Amino acid sequence: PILEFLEEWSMENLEEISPAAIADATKIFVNGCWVGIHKDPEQLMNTLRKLRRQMDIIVSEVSMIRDIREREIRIYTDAGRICRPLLIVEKQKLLLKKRHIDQLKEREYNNYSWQDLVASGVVEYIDTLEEETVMLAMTPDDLQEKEVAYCSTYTHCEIHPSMILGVCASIIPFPDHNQSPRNTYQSAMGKQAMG
Amino acid sequence: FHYAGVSAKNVTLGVPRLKELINISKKPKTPSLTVFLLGQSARDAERAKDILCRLEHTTLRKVTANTAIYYDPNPQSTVVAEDQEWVNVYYEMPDFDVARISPWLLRVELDRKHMTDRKLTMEQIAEKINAGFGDDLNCIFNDDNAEKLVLRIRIMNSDENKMQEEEEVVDKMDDDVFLRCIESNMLTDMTL
């Protein structure tokens, strides 16, 4: 489906490409195969991201990466890519709003769930390769709000920083107040506990 | 990782150094040599600098800003505008012109910063290149007053004549390819 859409959206195929024209245009790779080149990259990138956030043609797992310095757009539909969900920031305002959390709070008898949040475009799945092209905020309220200017172009926000930890490290209370090797050791000891 | 900046040198210490000493490895990971100066050279920093220059390997590639290989049929023609003056001065009383002049020209520009840092001399470099390749290379060097340090190198005039009636059609590397090989060898192994 992505290849069909790309053909629709003014992507010249490698076979039809004059060799001279490649130099000034971005190369579009899909699953590691160089499909063609596109003369205007940013418009295509925005359209692909809109499609993924609406879940129309591009599935949520599909990851689009644009390397602006190297003039390459890479789209991976491959399996085995590790992804984490991140809130989406437009302008400097989080897309997640009080109406969404109100619907989620009454998750029972409203049939509003994480899938609805993903479909609404509030959250998105980002793999590491796409993480390289994403400006993230650890805490939304602190970093999004205007201060002494550090970054005014945040594109995504972390849901909560404590989710970086795994299953065994999550049982540690106050992990940030410990030495790192001690958290590592507790991860191993917790597997051997009795219960 | 947890040495100090006081050493100001790469030093292998700990278990890897113990293994190097125990196994008596032919090649240490960081071979080092501590040189103690004899007399006034130890007292004065400048004399120590002289000894340093004497002890540190320096090649033409370190002091060469850029190299260009030109084709100039006539030395008097001076295809490069800049070298007109000193080529004309040298050919006012030309040397080795009687044998011939090789048309291909190797032009080497030497960075003044590196030249003065190692305290090398243009005449010194010319002498070293002349000794290394014998008479097969003819070198023309600018005066130090010139803003750009230029060394002009041509194939041997006797070799250009070939000094042989048969002349052999082998024509190994012609002259341009031979000049490129000469440039690579000079840059890598000049040992000025």
């Binding site: 030495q179 790192s180 | 990782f1 947890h2 040495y3 100090a4 900046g5």
Partner: peptide
């Protein structure tokens, strides 16, 4: 975890 000269 301390510094460059100390320990990690």
């Amino acid at each position: 975890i301390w510094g460059i000269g100390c320990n990690p």
